[PDB]
Scaffold this active site. Structure first.
Site, short mmCIF file in Angstrom:
data_model
loop_
_atom_site.label_atom_id
_atom_site.label_comp_id
_atom_site.label_asym_id
_atom_site.label_seq_id
_atom_site.Cartn_x
_atom_site.Cartn_y
_atom_site.Cartn_z
N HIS A 177 1.22 9.57 11.13
CA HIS A 177 -0.16 9.45 10.51
C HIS A 177 -0.06 7.82 10.78
N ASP A 225 -3.63 -15.03 36.30
CA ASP A 225 -2.26 -13.96 35.63
C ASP A 225 -2.21 -14.86 34.10
N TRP A 271 6.22 7.05 6.61
CA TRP A 271 6.94 5.96 7.48
C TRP A 271 7.78 5.33 7.05
N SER A 306 9.04 -2.51 23.82
CA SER A 306 7.97 -2.60 24.14
C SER A 306 6.77 -4.15 23.91
N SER A 307 7.34 -4.12 22.48
CA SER A 307 6.44 -4.63 21.73
C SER A 307 7.24 -6.32 21.90
N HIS A 310 6.77 -6.52 6.29
CA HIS A 310 6.05 -7.86 6.02
C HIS A 310 4.97 -8.40 6.91
N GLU A 341 5.66 -7.42 10.48
CA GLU A 341 4.81 -6.62 11.12
C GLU A 341 3.57 -6.09 10.59
N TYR A 378 1.49 -8.23 9.08
CA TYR A 378 1.06 -9.75 9.89
C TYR A 378 0.69 -10.02 11.19
N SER A 380 -13.40 -14.53 14.42
CA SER A 380 -13.79 -15.90 13.99
C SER A 380 -14.36 -16.44 15.22
N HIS A 423 7.97 -7.95 -1.81
CA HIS A 423 7.10 -7.71 -3.01
C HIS A 423 7.21 -6.13 -2.92
N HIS A 424 7.10 -5.26 -2.08
CA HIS A 424 7.24 -3.84 -1.24
C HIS A 424 8.59 -3.66 -1.89
N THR A 468 -4.95 -17.79 2.70
CA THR A 468 -5.02 -17.03 3.83
C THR A 468 -6.58 -16.83 2.35
N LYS A 476 -7.94 -19.44 4.42
CA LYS A 476 -9.21 -18.78 5.17
C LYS A 476 -10.70 -17.83 5.54
N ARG A 528 2.06 9.02 -3.82
CA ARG A 528 1.73 9.41 -3.09
C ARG A 528 2.42 10.58 -3.01
C1 HEA Z 1 -3.48 -5.37 7.20
C2 HEA Z 1 -2.35 -4.83 5.99
C3 HEA Z 1 -1.85 -5.94 5.43
C4 HEA Z 1 -2.39 -6.64 4.64
C5 HEA Z 1 -2.95 -7.76 4.79
C6 HEA Z 1 -1.68 -6.74 3.28
C7 HEA Z 1 -1.98 -8.18 2.38
C8 HEA Z 1 -0.94 -7.62 1.25
N1 HEA Z 1 -0.39 -6.77 1.03
FE1 HEA Z 1 0.54 -5.43 1.55
N2 HEA Z 1 0.90 -3.40 2.38
C9 HEA Z 1 0.40 -2.81 3.36
C10 HEA Z 1 -0.22 -3.59 4.07
C11 HEA Z 1 -0.70 -4.60 4.14
N3 HEA Z 1 -0.72 -5.23 3.36
C12 HEA Z 1 0.80 -1.57 3.55
C13 HEA Z 1 0.82 -0.71 4.81
C14 HEA Z 1 1.89 -1.42 2.37
C15 HEA Z 1 2.59 -0.23 1.73
C16 HEA Z 1 2.90 0.66 2.86
C17 HEA Z 1 3.64 1.98 2.02
O1 HEA Z 1 3.96 1.82 1.48
O2 HEA Z 1 4.84 2.66 2.74
C18 HEA Z 1 1.86 -2.36 1.54
C19 HEA Z 1 2.20 -2.15 0.22
C20 HEA Z 1 2.31 -3.69 -0.82
C21 HEA Z 1 2.20 -3.51 -1.55
C22 HEA Z 1 4.00 -2.57 -1.62
C23 HEA Z 1 3.64 -1.40 -3.66
C24 HEA Z 1 4.03 -1.03 -3.89
O3 HEA Z 1 4.05 0.05 -2.95
O4 HEA Z 1 4.89 -0.28 -4.56
C25 HEA Z 1 2.46 -5.02 -2.08
C26 HEA Z 1 3.20 -5.51 -3.06
O5 HEA Z 1 3.27 -6.68 -3.80
C27 HEA Z 1 1.88 -5.70 -0.87
C28 HEA Z 1 0.50 -6.82 -1.15
C29 HEA Z 1 0.54 -7.54 -0.22
C30 HEA Z 1 -0.72 -9.12 -0.67
C31 HEA Z 1 0.07 -9.34 -2.03
C32 HEA Z 1 -1.48 -8.97 0.07
C33 HEA Z 1 -2.09 -10.46 0.79
O6 HEA Z 1 -1.75 -11.12 2.28
C34 HEA Z 1 -3.42 -9.99 0.78
C35 HEA Z 1 -4.13 -11.92 1.08
C36 HEA Z 1 -5.21 -11.55 1.22
C37 HEA Z 1 -6.66 -12.41 1.01
C38 HEA Z 1 -7.74 -12.17 0.88
C39 HEA Z 1 -6.37 -12.69 -0.73
C40 HEA Z 1 -7.20 -13.19 -1.63
C41 HEA Z 1 -8.11 -14.45 -1.95
C42 HEA Z 1 -9.29 -14.91 -1.92
C43 HEA Z 1 -9.88 -13.59 -1.95
C44 HEA Z 1 -9.44 -15.72 -2.39
C45 HEA Z 1 -10.21 -16.47 -3.65
C46 HEA Z 1 -9.66 -15.69 -5.15
C47 HEA Z 1 -8.45 -16.12 -5.58
C48 HEA Z 1 -8.51 -17.90 -5.69
C49 HEA Z 1 -7.48 -15.99 -6.53
N4 HEA Z 1 1.47 -4.84 -0.64
C1 HEA Z 2 -3.79 1.46 10.79
C2 HEA Z 2 -3.06 2.12 9.39
C3 HEA Z 2 -3.76 3.15 9.09
C4 HEA Z 2 -5.26 3.82 9.46
C5 HEA Z 2 -6.29 3.66 10.13
C6 HEA Z 2 -5.41 4.47 8.47
C7 HEA Z 2 -6.71 5.38 7.76
C8 HEA Z 2 -6.82 6.82 7.38
N1 HEA Z 2 -6.10 6.81 6.50
FE1 HEA Z 2 -4.33 6.17 5.96
N2 HEA Z 2 -2.14 5.83 5.70
C9 HEA Z 2 -1.78 5.01 6.34
C10 HEA Z 2 -2.17 4.07 7.51
C11 HEA Z 2 -3.24 3.89 7.66
N3 HEA Z 2 -4.50 5.13 7.34
C12 HEA Z 2 -0.43 5.08 6.42
C13 HEA Z 2 0.36 3.57 6.67
C14 HEA Z 2 0.41 5.50 4.81
C15 HEA Z 2 1.23 5.82 3.82
C16 HEA Z 2 2.23 6.81 4.96
C17 HEA Z 2 3.91 7.19 3.93
O1 HEA Z 2 3.23 7.77 2.88
O2 HEA Z 2 4.68 6.44 4.59
C18 HEA Z 2 -1.34 6.17 5.00
C19 HEA Z 2 -1.70 7.22 4.12
C20 HEA Z 2 -2.52 8.17 3.78
C21 HEA Z 2 -2.64 9.22 2.81
C22 HEA Z 2 -1.56 9.51 2.01
C23 HEA Z 2 -1.17 10.65 2.43
C24 HEA Z 2 0.58 11.11 1.33
O3 HEA Z 2 0.77 10.42 0.95
O4 HEA Z 2 -0.43 12.01 0.47
C25 HEA Z 2 -3.93 9.26 3.16
C26 HEA Z 2 -5.40 9.71 2.34
O5 HEA Z 2 -5.87 10.21 2.20
C27 HEA Z 2 -4.45 8.99 4.32
C28 HEA Z 2 -6.31 8.38 4.86
C29 HEA Z 2 -6.60 8.25 5.62
C30 HEA Z 2 -7.65 8.24 6.01
C31 HEA Z 2 -8.39 9.91 5.60
C32 HEA Z 2 -8.30 7.02 7.05
C33 HEA Z 2 -9.32 6.82 7.51
O6 HEA Z 2 -10.09 5.62 7.81
C34 HEA Z 2 -9.46 7.14 9.54
C35 HEA Z 2 -10.32 6.49 10.10
C36 HEA Z 2 -10.10 5.67 11.01
C37 HEA Z 2 -10.07 5.48 11.91
C38 HEA Z 2 -10.87 7.06 12.71
C39 HEA Z 2 -9.61 4.00 12.97
C40 HEA Z 2 -10.93 4.17 14.32
C41 HEA Z 2 -10.50 3.66 15.22
C42 HEA Z 2 -10.84 4.95 16.34
C43 HEA Z 2 -11.58 5.47 16.22
C44 HEA Z 2 -9.68 5.56 18.07
C45 HEA Z 2 -9.95 3.83 18.44
C46 HEA Z 2 -10.37 3.68 19.75
C47 HEA Z 2 -10.49 2.29 20.53
C48 HEA Z 2 -11.57 0.97 19.71
C49 HEA Z 2 -11.73 2.73 22.04
N4 HEA Z 2 -3.37 7.48 4.78
CU LIG Z 3 3.45 -6.73 2.22
#
Ligand code: HEA
Ligand code: HEA
Ligand SMILES: [Cu+2]
Ligand SMILES: CCCCCCCCCCCCCCCCCC(=O)OCC(COC(=O)CCCCCCCCCCCCCCCCC)OC(=O)CCCCCCCCCCCCCCCCC
Ligand SMILES: CCCCCCCCCCCCCCCCCC(=O)OC[C@H](COP(=O)(O)OCCN)OC(=O)CCCCCCCCCCCCCCCCC
Ligand SMILES: CCCCCCCCCCCCCCCCCC(=O)OC[C@H](COP(=O)(O)OCCN)OC(=O)CCCCCCCCCCCCCCCCC
Ligand SMILES: CCCCCCCCCCCCCCCCCC(=O)OC[C@H](COP(=O)(O)OCCN)OC(=O)CCCCCCCCCCCCCCCCC
Ligand SMILES: CCCCCCCCCCCCCCCCCC(=O)OC[C@H](COP(=O)(O)OCCN)OC(=O)CCCCCCCCCCCCCCCCC
Ligand SMILES: CCCCCCCCCCCCCCCCCC(=O)OC[C@H](COP(=O)(O)OCCN)OC(=O)CCCCCCCCCCCCCCCCC
Ligand code: CUA
Ligand SMILES: [Mg+2]
Ligand code: NA
Ligand SMILES: [Zn+2]
Lengths: 47, 79, 76, 53, 48, 514, 44, 227, 260, 57, 94
Positions: F61, F91, F126, F156-157, F240, F242, F244, F255, F290-291, F316, F319, F438
């Protein structure tokens, strides 16, 4: 130029027959959906 | 000294929550007091306190493995 | 002028420098006849959790029987 | 972009908090006589460890 | 090209920049290292 | 002809189409994987017997959605389709290594599927955290196959990132400055810089435990002086960044769609746009731990990292506030893409605020590796990145094909997606606050309620996917061509006709002398 | 984005056939599999 | 240890958990503050019908737009800095305990005196005595006295885990070759529950944790009477 | 003449796809040999990817230095891409350096709390690693002389500069193989041994890549391929070889000057 | 070792339309057919071993 | 004593034509930004093409974040839709 261009024809899949094209999307995305089904049944056989 | 006590005291050297270094230091200077007082011929039981604190801080499997490694004579420390 | 200067530095600095470093190692390698250290089975050395994908799985890719003991000892 | 323009406004407050910091280190250094002055000999209350900081 | 003659400092001397950065980081690592073994020698010689 | 043009491709349009094909494939592979996950989580007890296969399917997943789905749409597909047609390039700079990265990605997909085929399975999540993925708990070819699949995806990336940076700083006509390109150009630039400076860290880590597994070394085995803390640092100093990479083309896409359909000729604060984007691109590295707050770090570096995440929250927020300001004050055509964009604004806002709540350090001591984190990354991926790419797809589909979707069907799709993700992942907020950890297959009575509710929402998302592929077929069957396109005077990709021809930008554009 | 009349217009019949087509076709995999999961479970 | 239809968090066992949920309530006040702000502004600009598509002037709001997040983020962060800086006072460790996470179970040892270790496992569902808890009950509970700071030395032997007690309100990663410190304090006698919170194999869901809080008198009574 | 822009035009090629498939065969051979001890697929992987990378660059040399599509803007982008690859490899190596620094700055408890861990005898850095630094720095200054002789236009001097820098690089490689045969322990022996053996052999893989690049640029220069200013092949060679010089210097100062 | 570039260039830029990956004649075409016959046959042999590792004995 | 071949007799094809264009001082392949910034009515901005259609992009304000893209055809001089500068097409067949 030397390669024909236009709407639809710039896709890897032929477009002109829509029933057959629907068959292509069903088999393609259905195999995509049924792949993890085949993994999970494969370990449930294997375990 | 010969103070009465029940539990390992907090090390002011290591405020941090990692005590692997703490018990490793306790193990090495326990062996240092044992060799130093076998050298001088004094009362070798004065570091029963350090013996108790390393026994308290780091686990039974680790101290048993290190003790067996010393007993067979292949300890990877500077002892 | 740059190309001449670099040619002069290569011939009069770099080549003599490599000659002196080669002579240093060559003289040392003739005088040093290292006393292979005694084998001690340290638990943090010669770790084998999985066999290597070549030979017997117990010899390293650049194994040297004279200086590199196995987990059991020297081979001689 | 304003933090680039008005970054000079924090230098004097930085010197103030740094000046108050080093003054606190001076009080820690010149403390051979905590509660040893013969005019201020009082036994320490049970909730405190030092007379002054 | 603005100036009629090419300046001697038109392009950065990359060998000089690399030597400067490498010497600075090497001296920082050496300084912090000698601070650490001086502290360790202090404690091991005075029993602290 | 077919093999020479498609199988032997060298043009960004066809390479982007095949990106979209493979991305749809991997996307519903991930959907089915998540449905196995969630149907196992729909019933109390164990539906799939052992939870080892549950760990395998959550690993699959995470891998196939993060590395195989939205990076191939947003970065690869949409980037290659838009960027030359957005800067005026015919191109891109290095199309053969572009195509080699493309044709090397489905081999990584094949290695992941073969790792699933292996008896052991990839029971690690993951993360590939040792010594769970070591020689004692995962003695098998599955985890090694996942490591080489990560190798292939990384290679590839990296070469794709080289492609994007060279095609931005090269293919531009010379008299236009860098600071007046469209916003998606800045998004792909900053993401590709982050790719280039982040993927070597992942490659180093996965090679590191690869040599731990097969070369009989001890980099992560503490009995020989190893350190799993080293792997966590390497992996998340990748992670982190990756993240962004994973998110910023969503910024660019929404935008562009907002300044398209909102009636504006420009985004608000384009200097503020680019400044915030390079701010998060710059200091996205130094926030990596922070993770990490509960592995045993020092208190001082924990305070440093949480302060740095509060800092990265600031621009952000600038933004999102300026997104509100750029959608201010114009006529809003009620396109489905605007529905996706507004849903993205709300759900990205709440996901980011939830992320800040995680970012406070002691609450992360209590709430680590818990479904509150799941609700974080599903509020910012499963509807953040997902609604961003749905907006991009339903916006630029006439350029991609030549025909349009049905607006009513697309709005119904937005409704189904929206309701499914909200009443899925708001119960995940409740689950994380209640606190089950989890990667669990079965749950007690307190968690059964929200598990059932969110599972029903997951099946709502299944219905959404089915409606999406139905309307793709409906568009390709009705084949309604586009007579005219608005805002072509300010959008470069829309003025070559729908679809753009094979050989676009034969003459480079006439930039003003100034 | 304005578009010319459909080159080919699906009939209620066509739309019905197709919507159901994938719906069933895309879900049928799940059908056969999820249906006999317990059997599959049998090591037999 | 959770109740059905739970929307908030566990009630506290530790004082640090008490002001931590106070701080958490502050952060919730912030999140609905910002969410209501963005919702009402979105609703305003979707309910409007006036057009302004000129060249927007920019350098007029960025100072407020950067100082209001500056102040709000720092007044969230300074409680975070305070709580993180008081996680680690000079301890008064009346009691010590080491926890050694084993492959698919736990080990607990009291090693201050009269060296004691035991292994704690998962009670099977068919072996569950009536009235107990599925996925939380453990055949050998871990006892600690109330109203005392007790030191927790966490490590693991083969696979990394996370000793998680959300009722006490902590979660420490058990790492091979590395032990971490957690100071536990309690206010109420009785049972408190937790689980593993790292992936650890084909019985990851099945290593739960139970801490029962007893006085020091009943603690030493158990220690003497278990022999 | 239909192409009006001065950018590059590509006739579609099979070789990206075949290189991708060759990489897939390489990794399949890696798992096949690491788990089921079979060498045939691995040898197939090496043969496939080496041949494919050969005719890929053979195609780019054909289409560049005889056909002439490599516009000054095109090698401007090429030097962009080479700089990007260089800095990616900087951060790859720097991840390896920081792994070593994390291992060495805090020595774990099983190592005795001292760097190196006790009981092993690492080689002295006094003589033959100074020889390594001398030979690599001499090769670097020789290729700077080669670049300036490209500027001047003196063919035999360019010939001797290249012959001496390949001679120096191959001497480097064969001698580091010789003290791989002459080192006290192996890569499976301890955290410290594992990290410097892996890092130094991985640098050895880069220096044999660089030496092969010097071989091929020599055989181009013998065929009168490079000219006075369109000499980007040797520019890439010089950048890569200065890269491996400075990376060798970093791993030298770290591994050898730090804890020995 | 005389100069060979200006005599072979006229055998490359002539516009007979046949693609640039086949300029050399039969030898490069032979190498192309050889590498086509092995990059696909080896891939079939690669997935066959993957299938045999997938399905146990 | 010549040694390395000089690029003026080494480079062929598109490099040869771009180098002879550089030494005669005229750039017909758009390696350089255009000249003759004059968008009046009596004189427009001249744009060379080989086709009948041609794209232009107006940066019609100094340090403008916006760029205005529009097509032109051979005939009357094309204009800018937000500033009004004039663009004219001339065919050059190279
Ligand atoms: C799109 C992907 C995405 C994005 C943007 C972010 C954004 C952020 N993430 Fe996260 N993060 C993940 C994907 C992402 N993360 C994933 C995939 C994991 C866990 C993977 C794993 O467990 O295996 C994770 C895990 C993760 C953890 C680990 C928790 C744990 O497992 O123990 C933490 C903790 O610090 C964290 C923090 C943040 C913070 C602080 C931001 C910030 O960048 C968010 C900022 C966005 C905002 C919009 C800011 C809000 C501000 C406003 C709304 C303006 C007005 C408000 C004020 C002025 C106060 N992220
Ligand atoms: C891109 C990242 C991504 C996305 C989209 C999702 C989507 C979803 N995730 Fe996922 N999830 C993760 C990343 C993501 N997850 C990660 C990183 C973990 C932690 C793994 C770990 O523990 O290590 C996790 C863990 C996770 C768990 C925890 C399992 C466990 O640890 O016990 C669960 C269970 O509810 C869950 C549920 C779902 C559900 C119900 C959706 C639904 O939103 C699914 C529906 C979304 C889509 C279907 C996407 C749309 C795309 C298309 C329809 C096709 C695209 C084609 C074109 C655009 C042409 N996710
Ligand atoms: Cu992070
Ligand atoms: C060209 C002329 C016809 C040649 C023969 C066509 C049939 C066989 C073939 O070679 O068929 C071609 C192949 C191409 O497949 C691949 O290349 C595999 C990629 C992985 O088709 C497949 O395998 C299945 C494709 C099914 C339909 C997919 C629809 C996707 C819709 C959603 C995305 C829209 C993007 C718009 C943009
Ligand atoms: C008591 C005082 C103790 C210290 C006294 C010396 C202080 C440092 C003096 C050296 C210095 O600053 O060197 C800087 C210089 C940087 O080089 P650069 O600026 O490029 O100038 C060369 C012109 N092409 O660096 C160099 O030229 C060489 C850099 C170091 C190489 C080893
Ligand atoms: C390992 C894979 C290496 C792939 C590689 O080096 O490909 C060469 C690549 C293709 O040449 P390219 O410049 O893209 O061709 C179009 C215009 N000549 O060449 C380039 O793109 C220029 C150099 C790129 C180096 C990438 C190294 C990885
Ligand atoms: C029952 C399922 C088949 C329904 C067929 C049908 O009634 O089609 C008519 C209509 C076609 O769509 P139409 O409203 O013409 O176009 C929307 C313009 N954006 O269909 C619709 O508008 C969709 C009706 C969906 C009913 C469920
Ligand atoms: C979208 C809103 C912003 C994100 C919120 C994420 C956290 C969350 O859902 O918190 C639920 C919050 C706290 O729960 P609480 O009401 O304290 O429960 C204990 C006594 N009932 O509970 C509430 O706020 C009340 C229920 C949800 C209201 C929305
Ligand atoms: C790991 C694999 C990747 C290593 C790094 C590869 C970097 C390649 C950079 C290529 C840059 C490039 O495209 O340069 C342009 C040049 C054509 O232009 P140019 O020749 O400069 O100008 C005409 C001269 N009158 O084109 C070229 O110069 C293309 C050829 C460059 C590479 C030549 C071959 C080097 C081979 C090194 C690896 C050898 C592998 C086999 C042996 C070791 C096996 C373990
Ligand atoms: Cu231990 Cu999960
Ligand atoms: Mg973890
Ligand atoms: Na379940
Ligand atoms: Zn204008």
């Amino acid at each position: 130029s030397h390669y024909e261009e236009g709407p639809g024809k710039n896709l890897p899949f032929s477009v002109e027959n829509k029933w057959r094209l629907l068959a292509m999307m069903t088999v393609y995305f259905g195999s995509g959906f049924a792949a993890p089904f085949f993994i999970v049944r494969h370990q449930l056989l294997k375990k | 000294k010969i103070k009465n006590y029940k539990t390992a005291p907090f090390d002011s050297r290591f405020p941090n929550q990692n005590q692997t270094k703490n018990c490793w230091q306790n193990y090495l200077d326990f062996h240092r007091c044992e060799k130093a007082m076998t050298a001088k011929g004094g009362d070798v039981s004065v570091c029963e306190w350090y013996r108790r604190v390393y026994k308290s801080l780091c686990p039974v499997s680790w101290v048993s493995a290190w003790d067996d490694r010393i007993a067979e004579g292949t300890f990877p420390g500077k002892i | 002028g740059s190309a001449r200067m670099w040619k002069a530095l290569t011939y009069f600095v770099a080549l003599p420098g490599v000659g002196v470093s080669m002579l240093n190692v060559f003289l040392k390698s003739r005088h040093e006849e290292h006393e292979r250290p005694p084998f001690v089975a340290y638990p943090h050395l010669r770790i084998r959790t999985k066999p290597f994908p070549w030979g017997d799985g117990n010899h390293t890719l650049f194994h040297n029987p004279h200086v590199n003991p196995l987990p059991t000892g020297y081979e001689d | 972009q304003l933090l680039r323009e008005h970054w000079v406004h924090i230098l004097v407050p930085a010197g103030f908090v740094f000046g108050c910091y080093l003054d606190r280190k001076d009080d820690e250094k010149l403390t051979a006589f905590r509660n040893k002055s013969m005019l201020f000999q009082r036994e320490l209350r049970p909730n405190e460890e030092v007379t002054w900081k | 090209k603005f100036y009629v003659r090419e300046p001697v400092n038109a392009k950065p001397n990359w060998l000089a920049v690399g030597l400067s950065v490498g010497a600075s980081v090497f001296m920082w690592i050496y300084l912090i290292q000698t601070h650490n073994e001086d502290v360790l020698e202090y404690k091991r010689r005075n029993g602290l | 002809m077919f093999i020479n043009r498609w199988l032997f491709s060298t043009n960004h349009k066809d390479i982007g189409t095949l990106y979209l094909l493979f991305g749809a494939w991997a996307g519903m592979v991930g959907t089915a994987l998540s449905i196995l996950i969630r149907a196992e989580l729909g019933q109390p007890g164990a539906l799939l017997g052992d939870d080892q296969i549950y760990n395998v399917i959550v690993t699959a997943h995470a891998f196939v959605m993060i590395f195989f789905m939205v990076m191939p749409m947003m970065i690869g597909g949409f980037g290659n389709w838009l960027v030359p047609l957005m800067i005026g390039a015919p191109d891109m700079a290095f199309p053969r290594m572009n195509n080699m990265s493309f044709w090397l990605l489905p081999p990584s997909f094949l290695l992941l599927l073969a790792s699933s085929m292996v008896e052991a399975g990839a029971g690690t999540g993951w993360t590939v955290y040792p010594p769970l993925a070591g020689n004692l708990a995962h003695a098998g070819a599955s985890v090694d196959l996942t490591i080489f699949s990560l190798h292939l995806a990384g290679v590839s990336s990296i070469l794709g990132a080289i492609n994007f940076i060279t095609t931005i700083i090269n293919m531009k006509p010379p008299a236009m400055t860098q600071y007046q390109t469209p916003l998606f150009v800045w998004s792909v630039l900053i993401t590709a810089v982050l790719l280039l400076l982040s993927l070597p860290v992942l490659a180093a880590g996965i090679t590191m435990l690869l040599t731990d597994r097969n070369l009989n070394t001890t980099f992560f085995d503490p009995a020989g002086g190893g350190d799993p803390i080293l792997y966590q640092h390497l992996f998340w100093f990748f992670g982190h960044p990756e993240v962004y990479i994973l998110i910023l083309p969503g910024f660019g896409i929404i935008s562009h769609v907002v300044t398209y359909y909102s009636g504006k000729k420009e985004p608000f604060g384009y200097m503020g746009m680019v400044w915030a984007m390079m701010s998060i691109g710059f200091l996205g590295f130094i926030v990596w731990a922070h993770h990490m707050f509960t592995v045993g770090l020092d208190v001082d570096t924990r305070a440093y990292f949480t302060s740095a995440t509060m800092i990265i929250a600031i621009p952000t927020g600038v933004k999102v506030f300026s997104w509100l300001a750029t959608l201010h004050g114009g006529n809003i055509k009620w396109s489905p893409a605007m529905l996706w964009a507004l849903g993205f604004i709300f759900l990205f806002t709440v996901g980011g605020l939830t992320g800040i709540v995680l970012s406070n350090s002691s609450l992360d001591i209590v709430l680590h590796d818990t479904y509150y984190v799941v609700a974080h990354f599903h509020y910012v991926l499963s509807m953040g990145a997902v609604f961003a790419i749905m907006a991009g797809f339903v916006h630029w589909f006439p350029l991609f094909s030549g025909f349009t979707l049905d607006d009513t069907w697309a709005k119904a799709h937005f409704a189904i997606m929206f309701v499914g993700v909200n009443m899925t992942f708001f119960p995940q907020h409740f689950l994380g606050l209640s606190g089950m950890p989890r990667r669990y297959s079965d749950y007690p009575d307190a968690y059964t309620t929200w598990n059932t509710v969110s599972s029903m929402g997951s099946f709502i998302s299944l219905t959404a996917v089915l409606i999406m592929i139905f309307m793709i077929w409906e568009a390709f069957a009705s084949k309604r061509e586009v007579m005219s396109v608005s805002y072509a005077s300010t959008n470069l990709e829309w003025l070559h006709g729908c679809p753009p021809p094979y050989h676009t930008f034969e003459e480079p554009t006439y930039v003003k002398v100034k | 984005v304005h578009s010319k009349p459909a080159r080919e217009q699906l009939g209620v019949l066509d739309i019905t056939i197709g919507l159901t087509s994938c719906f069933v076709c895309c879900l049928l995999p799940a059908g056969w599999v999820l249906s006999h999961l317990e059997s599959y479970k049998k090591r037999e | 240890m959770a109740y059905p239809f739970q929307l908030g968090l566990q009630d506290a066992t530790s004082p640090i958990m008490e002001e931590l949920m106070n701080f958490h309530d502050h952060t919730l006040m912030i999140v609905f503050l910002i969410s209501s702000l963005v919702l009402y502004i979105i609703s305003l600009m979707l309910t409007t019908k006036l057009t302004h598509t000129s060249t927007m002037d920019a350098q007029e709001v960025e100072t407020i737009w950067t100082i209001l997040p500056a102040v709000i983020l720092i007044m969230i962060a300074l409680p975070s800095l305070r709580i993180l800086y008081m996680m680690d006072e000079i301890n008064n460790p009346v009691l010590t305990v080491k926890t050694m996470g084993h492959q698919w179970y736990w080990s607990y040892e009291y090693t201050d005196y009269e060296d004691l270790c035991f292994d704690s496992y998962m009670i099977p569902t068919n072996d569950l005595k009536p009235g107990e808890l599925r996925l939380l009950e453990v055949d050998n509970r871990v006892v600690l006295p109330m109203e005392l700071p007790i030191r927790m030395l966490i490590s693991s032997e083969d696979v990394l885990h996370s000793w998680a007690v959300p009722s006490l309100g902590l979660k420490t990663d058990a790492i091979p070759g590395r032990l971490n410190q957690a100071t536990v304090t309690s206010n109420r006698p009785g049972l408190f529950y937790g689980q593993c919170s790292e992936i650890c194999g084909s019985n990851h869901s099945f290593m739960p944790i139970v801490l029962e809080m007893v006085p020091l008198k009943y603690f030493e009574n158990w220690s003497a009477s278990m022999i | 003449t239909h192409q009006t822009h001065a950018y590059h035009m590509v006739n579609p090629s099979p070789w990206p796809l075949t290189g991708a498939f060759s990489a897939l065969l390489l990794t399949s051979g890696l798992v096949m040999w690491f788990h089921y001890n079979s060498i045939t697929l691995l040898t197939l992987g090496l043969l496939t990817n080496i041949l494919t990378m050969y005719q890929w660059w053979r195609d780019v040399i054909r289409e560049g230095t005889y056909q002439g599509h490599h516009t000054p803007i095109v090698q401007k982008g090429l030097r962009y891409g080479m700089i990007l690859f260089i800095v990616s490899e900087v951060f790859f190596f720097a991840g390896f350096f920081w792994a070593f620094y994390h291992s060495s700055l805090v020595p774990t408890h099983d190592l005795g709390g001292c760097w190196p861990p006790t009981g092993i005898s690492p080689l002295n850095p006094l003589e033959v690693p100074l020889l390594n630094t001398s030979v690599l720095l001499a090769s670097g200054v020789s290729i700077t002389w080669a670049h300036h002789s490209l500027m001047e236009g003196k063919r035999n001097h360019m010939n001797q500069a290249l012959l001496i820098t390949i001679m120096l690089g191959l001497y480097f490689t064969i001698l580091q193989a010789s003290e791989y045969f002459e080192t006290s322990f192996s890569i499976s022996d301890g955290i410290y041994g594992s990290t410097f053996f892996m890092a130094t052999g991985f640098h050895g893989l880069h220096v044999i890549i660089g030496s092969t690049f010097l071989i091929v640029c020599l055989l181009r220069q013998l065929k009168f391929h490079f000219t006075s200013k369109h000499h980007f092949g040797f520019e890439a060679a010089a950048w890569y070889w200065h890269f491996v010089d400075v990376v060798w210097l970093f791993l030298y100062v770290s591994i050898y000057w730090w804890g020995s | 070792f005389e100069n060979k570039v200006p005599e072979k260039q006229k055998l490359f830029q002539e516009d007979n339309g046949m693609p640039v990956h086949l300029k050399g004649g039969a030898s490069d075409a032979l190498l192309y057919r050889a590498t086509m016959a092995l990059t696909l046959g080896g891939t079939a042999y690669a997935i066959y071993l993957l299938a045999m590792a997938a399905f146990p004995k | 004593g010549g040694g390395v071949p000089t690029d003026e007799e080494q480079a062929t094809g598109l490099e040869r034509e771009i180098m002879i264009a550089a030494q005669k001082g005229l750039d017909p392949y758009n390696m350089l930004p255009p000249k003759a910034a004059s968008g009046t009515k009596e004189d427009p901005n001249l744009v060379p093409s080989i086709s009948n259609k041609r794209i232009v992009g107006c940066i019609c304000e100094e340090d403008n974040c916006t760029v205005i893209w529009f097509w032109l055809h051979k005939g009357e001089s094309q204009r800018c839709p937000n500033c009004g500068t004039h663009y004219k097409l001339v065919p050059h067949q190279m």
